Predict the 3D structure of the following.
Amino acid sequence: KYEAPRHGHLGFLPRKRAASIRARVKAFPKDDRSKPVALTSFLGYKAGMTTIVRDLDRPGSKFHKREVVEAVTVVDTPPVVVVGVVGYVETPRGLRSLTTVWAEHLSDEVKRRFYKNWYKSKKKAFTKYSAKYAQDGAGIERELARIKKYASVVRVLVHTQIRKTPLAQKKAHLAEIQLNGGSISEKVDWAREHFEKTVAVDSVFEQNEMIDAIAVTKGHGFEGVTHRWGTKKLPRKTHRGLRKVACIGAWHPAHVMWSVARAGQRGYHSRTSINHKIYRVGKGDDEANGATSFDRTKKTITPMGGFVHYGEIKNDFIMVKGCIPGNRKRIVTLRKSLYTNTSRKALEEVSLKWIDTASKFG
Amino acid sequence: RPARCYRYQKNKPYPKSRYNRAVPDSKIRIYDLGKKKATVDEFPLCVHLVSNELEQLSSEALEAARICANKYMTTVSGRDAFHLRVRVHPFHVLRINKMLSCAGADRLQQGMRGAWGKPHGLAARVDIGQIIFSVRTKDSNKDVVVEGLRRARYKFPGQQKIILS
Amino acid sequence: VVIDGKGHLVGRLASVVAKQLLNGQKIVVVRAEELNISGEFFRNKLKYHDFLRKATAFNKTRGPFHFRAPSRIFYKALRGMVSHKTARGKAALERLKVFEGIPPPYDKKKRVVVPQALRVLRLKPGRKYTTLGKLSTSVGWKAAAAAAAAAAAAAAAAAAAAAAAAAAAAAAAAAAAA
RNA sequence: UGGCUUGUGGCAGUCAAGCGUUCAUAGCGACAUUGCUUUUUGAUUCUUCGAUGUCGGCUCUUCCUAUCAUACCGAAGCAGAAUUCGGUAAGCGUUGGAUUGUUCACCCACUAAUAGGGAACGUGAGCUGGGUUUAGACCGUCGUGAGACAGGUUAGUUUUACCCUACUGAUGAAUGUUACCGCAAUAGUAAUUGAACUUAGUACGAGAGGAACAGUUCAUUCGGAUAAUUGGUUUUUGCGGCU
RNA sequence: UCCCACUGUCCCUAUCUACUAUCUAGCGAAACCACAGCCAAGGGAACGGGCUUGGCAGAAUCAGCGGGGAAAGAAGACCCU
RNA sequence: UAGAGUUAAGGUGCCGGAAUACACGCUCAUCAACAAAAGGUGUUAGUUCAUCUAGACAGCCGGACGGUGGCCAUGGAAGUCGGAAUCCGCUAAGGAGUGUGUAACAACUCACCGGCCGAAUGAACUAGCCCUGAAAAUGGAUGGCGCCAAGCGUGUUACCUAUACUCUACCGUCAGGGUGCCCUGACGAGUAGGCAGGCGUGGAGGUCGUGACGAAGCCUGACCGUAAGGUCGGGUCGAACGGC
RNA sequence: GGGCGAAAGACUAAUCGAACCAUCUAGUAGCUGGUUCCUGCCGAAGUUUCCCUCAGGAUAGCACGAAGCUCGUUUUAUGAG
RNA sequence: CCAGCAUCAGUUUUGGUGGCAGGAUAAACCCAUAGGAAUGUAGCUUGCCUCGGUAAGUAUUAUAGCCUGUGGGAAUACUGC
């Protein structure tokens, strides 16, 4: 009953498909016990990268404040629209509300979405898009919600506004998003001014915190043991056992556990990557790219031309030094970081020195 | 074979000078030690290391206890006021089996058949009541063999009961 | 028959509960954490039935499932008496559910009226002995308010008795003043 | 083969007289034994012929610590520091080549440095078939001989689609219903080290030497994230030559 | 065996391509018939999913993969009459 | 072969029926659950003896004396190396010495012994509960829950307990008295094996009896009770077959 | 038991170290396996002298089946570790 | 027709409770009187030290051990009712 060393990550079991295109995360990043109102996460779309030629954050370096080449995902963040701020409190059973406080006017892309009109799946009943529901009487009793003592974290059901980013569809992408803030009272009080229609981007993301890069990754294949775990080939490479593996079980006992080196789905969950440090926030048009060299390929920010398989960016973006899962077209969900490691390098803006602009190709 | 495995005896007697095709050599160096002269003369006090058990005190450990107590009793004097004996001898020649082996061997050496314990060692019998290490030692002041009976029963299998004689 | 598991030993309550469950009588035990198992904090540490070494990481795929809470001890413990094996056994198991806290506000068989044994006196007896609501702490037992609060719930039950209760009492008093 | 004992024996407690400058135990230890134990090394036909297929290594599927190294502590017949020894404690790290079939045997270059034990040593319907059960032919050694040998040499079969289970991915249905997502009563997880800037030329010393403790950065290596300044592929779509 | 140039065998794996797997129609094999199908400890025809206690174990369905039971098969290759 | 009447071997906190009983006691470690050499201020009892108001014993507090460096091993020996004499002194105590210290002097402490205090203390010897010696790999792994009495000894009491024990009847062959058989003794788990008894097919000397106004058969129901398998009855047949 | 050899008993209808087909032939197996109603009466033995004898069997030990009949508890001594 | 099981009235066999008694015996749940040996508690007096107690006398306040003499009590092993 031996062991051979840990080639590949064990605990992505089961390797379940992330059906919904936007990433979810049950364990949300807990409160900013500093900022009086925030959100927990936000929204993005994966677009492309640039080489930010700047200078180091770590100030005591041997080559301190030199020229530094760096990755950056420049993800488009249009602000999300509220349907209603749901006032989750407690009861003596559990995490149960009392009322929501609706928004009056929603967006336009609420037409096609609020349903589950898809084949081999359940509906919803005729809870369609909004008429004019509970907000008038509901807005005052969320004050009385904290007076219960039985009171929990108040949240807000949101939807996107799409075309603004170059993707042309008008059926919105849904999610609930938790409201953070100072205390339970404050994430209710200041969130009354949030449900009006649209929220702020800058409430959750302060410039130069960190931002944990969760999104939905690509489904690579039905990947075998070589790529999915990390086995080799045998150098004889004949017969049956080329890209196979050896042991799955063991003689004594016959019954093993969930470590075994088999084939199946790779990637494609709502997989969480850790503290990618936020570079800058730029609202409109600032940085460019497009340089005629081989580096890595096919995602170009305002060159001569545009991006391939996305569209040219004329919106409002947030720049994360690092990355975030998906590929082109894929809609992402940027969660914030609860444990912010390094000291916040805010107040002033971070350096942009110069950047190229030409073709990307020949 | 440690002396844990030279304890009891389903080895039954076999010890005569007539009927023996020659014994091996022993370790045994000297019997009476300290005083040769005084048995009960100078020494009205004794301790006997009386057996509880019916063991074979093998000739290996027999010399061992006696020679530890020989080397010890030189500090006080190399003929101090004790009389450490050897009594009952290896009369019996200790029969021990092996080289043995059934199939797949030189000539075949058996074990079961070939039951004869082909004479290897020598052992004394030190049964109930009997002692080897009788220590006739002095009345007043220098009694040294009470200590030297820890050093006697150590180089001896079994749990001997110390009796004042 | 509803009892209360409060301020005595664990095994000498479990035994008494089993003979009552026997046929199919619906005995629910209320409180597990205010019982008392014995042992040290040294030998009864490493191999103990919460999380330390043994019974939490104690499973296969088709295999066991234990606990790391002072609530779940008494539930698992009385499968370990009355087993699922016999038909009456698995039936008798469902007649019992244990609760953390005291959700009934009323006074049933609790302290003064209980069976025999139970409330052992430690004088000449007993230097070392544990308590289930100490042992389970650095095992994954948090969240005290949630379970510990239950005491706060039991309080509001008392309150309901003390009312109306208080009223019939004040009356009863005036009755004898007479 | 499995069982049994521990024979043959390994380890420790340890009788502790000796001998190391004085000095039973800094250290070395005559003489050996008692308990434990199953490793050197085998006693036994108990249990087995309608299969009981071998060794070193590649690859991938565990648990314990009889402990090499990382956290924490104490002592010396130890001057700081080099040197010497013992206790708490299993989460993690544990090299590259040459002699030799080969771990053994035996040597070298470094490096922070290169452990112990079991588990059908994962282990031939994943894998090599060098090590490893027959059949060309020769020599030594033995017997009247056909031929033999407790001695060596030369060539000489790894077939095929997993019934049931372990088991890794993907869908379908159960207290009205339900697109959409937060609790944490619980399940799975991640892991290491060195150098340099610099501390400090300070402690302490005959002389070589140079400790406590900070702030700062980064390089080996792993996984997840990975598509821009890198390196390459791109039969899709375009460009050069010959019959 | 030394020696010169050198080498996907490996370091170090990635990418693209032909054909199929997935999925579908038709006609239609193969030797082939144990009640049954969890694990840890315990007793034991002597290494139990099957027997003792305890922990665990639901069904409609398909794609996968080489660890056990020990497959597809012949009355063992060792070994003696 | 069956229901009662009475109890063995052995059990009663609980899975799972029966004391959370009674009396006395060491001990409470979860002891209960392996292990020697060799060893211990846990904790209790008995016996003998040193010791005691004739001032036990501890702590704290002193006198550390004169002869004197007594003498002698030896290169040197110094109380302080080895070995013997064995005192005087001042006769309310200091030995020719309990321990440390420097080659050693140089230096230091004290049983012996002094001074406060004022009651049971201490060595042996014997017995019991504890306690130290004791390492290995899949999930409790020296019980599931767990127990400090729901442990154990000694003394007692209550409840449970083998087709045996035991009541009486019944089943099997055989004996005796007297046929027809009945009374009735002793035993009756069972494989080989022998004997006896009973059920059995094809066939037949026999063959009458039953039959086309419905035979064997097919199929289905009723269906005695010694284990063996056979009579009656219903739907239906279109010629076969048993009294004796 | 011949044909045949530069040798390997290669070779001869997939059979060759003695082709194949048919008959005598249902050769034979001192060894192994399989083998059909019931109850009752009633039911042992694994021991031996002995064998060119050993998974056997003449004989003896013990109870089969059938007919006719058959104890001891213990008292006086005598012999032998 | 055997076993389980059967209206309604009377009776045996075996054991116990509860009440009572004989064999045979006298301790008791607890039983008289006289003389001699003993020694506990309350109260008083006297002496001495000290603020807290102690010693001696106390048959002359009240009561007893153990033996001897005289006199008087006395339900039960077993067995039956």
Notes: The helical segments of chain A are 186-189, 225-228. Residues 1, 252-253, 255 of chain A lie near RNA strand F (CB under 10 Å from a C1').
